[PDB]
């Protein structure tokens with residue numbers, strides 16, 4: 001109760017910034033997460049014994065794939081942490097509690113394959129869940145771990161607070177399905193621009209928490225160039241493995257997933273920044289102005305990909 005988590009000085013300072021990288025020491029990632037819960041939520045939010053047991057079960061249910069792994073989960077939670085700390089007064093006690101947990105859990109038991117590959121393979125999960133296939137699975141795995149003995153970090157909540165927090169987490173995790181992001185941002189664009197965006201409207205909050213989830217999920221484009229660039233290698237290593245698997249089913253994959261079309265990576269990054277990342281962080285900065293550093297860092301990395309194309313690296 002009188003037990004703080006503290007971090008070495010460089011981490012204690014750098015963890016508050018959007019562009020923080022959690023480092024290559026896996027054994028420090030739980031401590032980093034707990035540190036972030038304590039400052040974002042309070043040391044009273046979760047029974048420490050229960051939190052540590054929940055963190056370790058979550059970790060154990062991430063797989064050793066190149067990108068969609070335990071480091072991705074803690075990275076996406078840290079970005080949520082930065083957004084929540086730079087927008088103190090906008091969010092409920094429940095929202096702060098649910099959103100860091102949603103982010104840690106958002107890709108539970110990911111196999112490194114898209115919803116599309118599950119559907120073309122005819123994976124059982126695509127019969128159980130016809131849309132947002134992996135995301136409904138991730139929420140399912142979250143509920144499972146929460147129901148393990150000694151793992152109910154929410155046990156102290158009222159029946160109905162418990163229900164509101166699992167419903168925040170469910171919507172938050174579903175929203176990481178990028179197919180859903182495009183319409184969600186178009187609506188947020190229109191509501192902000194016509195002046196109708198209202199944060200007391202629960203369906204408006206939902207959309208806004210949705211956009212933050214896309215922003216956190218994509219935060220590798222908001223890091224220092226060497227982090228961003230090395231993460232792109234992990235991202236493509238899954239996509240190309242997925243393309244291999246498409247070819248094994250007798251299907252030409254899209255070029256994004258075709259390791260034979262590596263040479264066109266720089267132009268694909270451009271499309272992605274222009275079609276996905278920039279619009280995401282633009283609309284996010286409009287709604288939540290202290291998130292501007294994410295937009296500024298994304299634009300800097302877009303300009304680094306422009307340099308790659310011009311053969312200036």
Ligand SMILES: Cn1cc(-c2ccccc2)nc1C#Cc1ccc2nc(C3CC3)c(CO)n2n1
Pocket residue numbers: 217218219220221231232235255256257261262263264265266267268269271272
């Ligand atoms: C649309 N597209 C087409 C091609 C392409 C085409 C032909 C040949 C080679 C490549 N590449 C893309 C892109 C990809 C892609 C997808 C998701 C994603 N999340 C992130 C960060 C959030 C972690 C990044 C990093 O920027 N990405 N990058």
Ligand SMILES: [Mg+2]
Pocket residue numbers: 106107134176177
């Ligand atoms: Mg995901």
Ligand SMILES: [Zn+2]
Pocket residue numbers: 072076106107176217
């Ligand atoms: Zn993710």
